[PDB]
Amino acid sequence: GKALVIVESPAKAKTINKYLGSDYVVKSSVGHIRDLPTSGSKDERGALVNRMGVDPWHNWEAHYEVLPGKEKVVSELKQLAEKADHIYLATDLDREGEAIAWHLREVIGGDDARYSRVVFNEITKNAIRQAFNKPGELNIDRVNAQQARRFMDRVVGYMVSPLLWKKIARGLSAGRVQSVAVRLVVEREREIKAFVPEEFWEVDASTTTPSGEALALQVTHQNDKPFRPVNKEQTQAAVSLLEKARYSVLEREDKPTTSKPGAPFITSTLQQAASTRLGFGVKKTMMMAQRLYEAGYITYMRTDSTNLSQDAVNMVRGYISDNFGKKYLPESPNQYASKENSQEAHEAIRPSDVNVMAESLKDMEADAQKLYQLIWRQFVACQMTPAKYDSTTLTVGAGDFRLKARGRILRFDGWTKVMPALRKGDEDRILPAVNKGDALTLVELTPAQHFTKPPARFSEASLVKELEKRGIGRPSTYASIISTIQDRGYVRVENRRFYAEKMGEIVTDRLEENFRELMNYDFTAQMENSLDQVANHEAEWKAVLDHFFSDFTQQLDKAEKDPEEGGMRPNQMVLTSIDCPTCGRKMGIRTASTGVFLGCSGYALPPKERCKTTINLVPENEVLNVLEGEDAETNALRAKRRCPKCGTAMDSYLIDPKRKLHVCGNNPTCDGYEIEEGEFRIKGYDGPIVECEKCGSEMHLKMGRFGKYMACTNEECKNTRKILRNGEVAPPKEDPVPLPELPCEKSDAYFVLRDGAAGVFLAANTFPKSRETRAPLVEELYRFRDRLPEKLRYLADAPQQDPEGNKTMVRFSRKTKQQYVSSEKDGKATGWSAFYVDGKWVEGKK
DNA sequence: GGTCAGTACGTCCTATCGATCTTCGGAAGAGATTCAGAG
RNA sequence: UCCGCGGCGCG
DNA sequence: CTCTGAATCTCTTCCGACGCGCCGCGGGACGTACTGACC
Ligand SMILES: [Zn+2]
Ligand SMILES: [Zn+2]
Ligand SMILES: [Zn+2]
């Protein structure tokens, strides 16, 4: 017989075909085939329930639908199911996969015994074999939980968005967890803008040992009180007093220290680590993680369990025993404890085969290889022996002052070998072995000025960590929350940090005022826990949906009323002394979904006296300096003015090339505004921004007779790139290089080397006439290595012949957008290829 | 799983509107604007 | 085999 | 002094003989990699 396996991604289809075989047929059902309506294709209540699809009053009838373009796939799947005998639903582990499987089952038919739900955490031979050995039944409870979540989201969105349109502004949106995330960001922004940085100085001293060794220490006490000078004069006086005094090392301290490795990656930890080390965002991290999982190299990327299988434990222990040695084993496995509410049935994010190094991933892009290296290193480290340091602490007294120094020396690098630190820390230095009660000689000292840091702005990783802490969201939803808070125009991300737009503040204030139950963190956490209980078959989904809908309806009917009755307050106006170009009247500051702008009061007047003239603003972007490190945020807060009526800082906008505007942070609650005059270069540009590889200047998008292209703004540089079908911009095509020594074979012309998105190729010099092209050989490139531009020279370094001695050719991998070298025999590929991974060429069988 | 056939994307190549060839006469119809008559 | 353009010629 | 209708002006579109012969020139095509289906 023939059994049908339905999977979601075509890549998953290929990888699972890599282990199922000829007996089975695998079909890729791209995405969700059945979903609630999206487009438009007591009558108000009927219209609302038709728009939502769900009818909460009538026991939550669903009215699912098949989106356009899915009909062909539905027909193909139905035909294959008629052909097949047993249908296998092999979607992913999470609730989303169960929902997809339930949708497929409902579409195809013949429910009772024709379907088997396959559960595998990694696409590998053993895992697939065990998964297909005893297939499981479709878990209806998890499907119900997913549907409950979707219904809650749709109800809130389609029942709040009209309210926000009526009261605040058209074009708004709302979401149950999206609103809570925006609230977190807005609260952090308010804490930051309320912060008034203090100032404090510090003193560093240089000393030389009687043995001649050097030491650097930091002064920490004065008069047995903490040393924290406020003003420069006090700092100079302290420095003078320190110089006058005599120094002696009155305290010596030593202590062994141990550092244990980190736990294996759960999804939140993986995102944090990717952001901190490789700089990836959450979207890129999860996309590459999904690619790695589908290709079969890593386990499922949506998890909250640090548990590891016995097979994985034995594999990694064997790898450590074979490669590193017994000093790194250690005697017993390293256990890590996850949350009691976590999906302990799942594993962590680990490699599917420890011996596959990151360089060997031929079919994964460079970023994917880096992510896999991170996962592999974490997995190896999690079972290695703790690293050992010895720490030295020195305290030196001089007059009324005391100064301190601390350092550590590493002696065993068991877990730090595979997972090295990004940079050396302040304590990663060598303090000389001074004696107890020793003496020191002095060198010139250095003062320093600092300002107390404000609370750190949310990074994507940090926001995800906060959400994990509060219980808001789940592993399968973090990326959705992060993407949706940005797409909906309430919060932007710049400098790899979260910034709150004013519209976000307005919507957050209104939602807190009217829907206090929905926006509370504890209630959101309780709702998530209730969904989890439903998944565990601890509660009935319709019951909790009804409870939430009852509370939400009460709150909504309360909120829809007039502001005097207690409804949602409108977008109040802050008036300022500016002349309206149409009627010279004073102009207010308003916020729409587009941004923050200047309007005229005439907008509030009837058409007889109405004024629609508006002034568009351009906010000033904060440019944090990466070199300033931790200071980058602090200096930013120091750059802003301060509102006169309150200590809250103010945000800057430009109104004229001569005039700039400052708006209070609590606008429109606080009406403080300021106007400044000066020479201001208006940005005057919008749209794509590219960096010119020829001069490093900004490159902009332009349109002409040939469509759309990209040209550099530098008047001295006319470099132009082009837009292609499925990319932001074409790669930096290099200048063609002629080769008179390579003759054509079908004609009398000579070959010329050209570059492009297709790759690097050889073409006839009379291209419109000869039209003869062939790929270059590595030996051919080595023959004319000198003429090759600086970039392409690496191709000449690639191995010229395979282990079988056959000749190699330069090819372009479009799936990874990179050049490799492959050998061919008798015109067929020998299956040997070498790629360029981090400055070296790695070769292997294809 | 491996192989073959089919399908998809790139190269030639742009980037200022500037290349480019460019400019009738007569009659009819539709739309827009102006003048005269009536109110 | 098709289309197009240009030029020239005859009745 | 104003409004409406009719008349006039402006702009756009359509048509312009038939038949035959000769010469010249031009006109998207080819290559490589990746994915799916069948065996
Ligand atoms: Zn106005
Ligand atoms: Zn203020
Ligand atoms: Zn440039």
Our separate counts of H helices and E strands in chain A read 22, 35
Query: For residue A660, what are the β-bridge partners?
Result: A654, A676
Q: Which amino acid is at A564?
A: E
Strands A24-28 and A3-7: parallel
Q: CA(A535)–C1'(B19) in Å?
A: 69
- CA-nearest of A305, A334, A309, A306 to A320 is A334
- CA-nearest of A452, A460, A423 to A633 is A452
Q: Which tokens go with A727?
A: 């990319």
Q: Within 13 Å, how many C-alpha atoms sit on residue A91's CB side?
A: 25
d(CA A197, CA A200): 10
Burial class (CB within 10 angstroms; exposed 0-12, middle 13-18, buried 19+) of A256: exposed
End-to-end CA distance of chain A: 33
d(CA A47, CA A591): 30
For strand B, the positions having any atom within 7 A of a protein Cβ are: 1-2, 9-18
d(CA A711, CA A175): 41
- CA-nearest of A104, A25, A309, A311 to A16 is A25
Q: CA(A768)–C1'(C9) in Å?
A: 36
Query: For residue A259, what are the β-bridge partners?
Result: A387
d(CA A210, CA A484): 63
What is the H or E stretch that residue A26 is in? Answer: strand A24-28
- CA-nearest of A531, A504, A806, A510 to A665 is A504
Strands A115-117 and A87-89: parallel
Preceding omega of A668 cis (within 30 degrees of 0): yes
CA–centroid distance, residue A500 to ligand 1 (Å)? 29
Residue at token pair 């990326």: A479
Q: Which nucleotide is at minimal CA–C1' distance from A13?
A: D36
Largest Cα–Cα separation, chain A:
95
3-state DSSP assignment of residue A561: coil
Dump the DSSP string for A174-241.
--HHHHHHHHHHHHHHHHHHH----EEEEEEEEEE-TTS-EEEEEEEEETTEE----SHHHHHHHHHH
- CA-nearest of A459, A477, A456 to A468 is A477
Q: Which tokens go with A502?
A: 């004013």
Q: Which tokens go with A418?
A: 């595979």
Q: Which amino acid is at A337?
A: A
d(CA A673, CA A655): 13
Evaluate whether A378 touches A372 at the Cβ level (below 8 Å): no
What is the H or E stretch that residue A115 is in? Answer: strand A115-117
**Any idea how long chain A is?**
846
Please give the resolution of this entry in Å, rounded to 1 decimal: 2.7
d(CA A546, CA A536): 19
Residues of A catalogued as catalytic: 300
| Helical axes A460-470 vs A282-295, angle rounded to 10° | 80
The count of other CB atoms within 10 Å of the CB of residue A485 is 27
d(CA A304, CA A298): 15
Q: Which amino acid is at A135?
A: P
d(CA A670, CA A574): 8
Q: Can you give the three-state secondary structure of A58-69, one letter per residue?
A: CCCECCCECCCC
| CA A707, chain centre distance (Å) | 33
Cα-based distances in Å from A491 to A172, A467, A486, A580 = 13, 16, 5, 30
Residue A711 contacts strand B, CB under 7 A: yes
d(CA A546, CA A568): 25
Query: For residue A811, what are the β-bridge partners?
Result: A820
Residue A10 contacts strand D, CB under 7 A: yes
Cα-based distances in Å from A759 to A731, A811, A817, A818 = 10, 7, 9, 8
Method: cryo-EM
Evaluate whether A260 touches A380 at the Cβ level (below 8 Å): no
Q: What residues have CB less than 8 Å from A202, skipping those under 6 apart?
A: A218, A219, A447, A448, A450
Q: CA(A707)–C1'(D12) in Å?
A: 31
Q: Within 13 Å, how many C-alpha atoms sit on residue A584's CB side?
A: 0
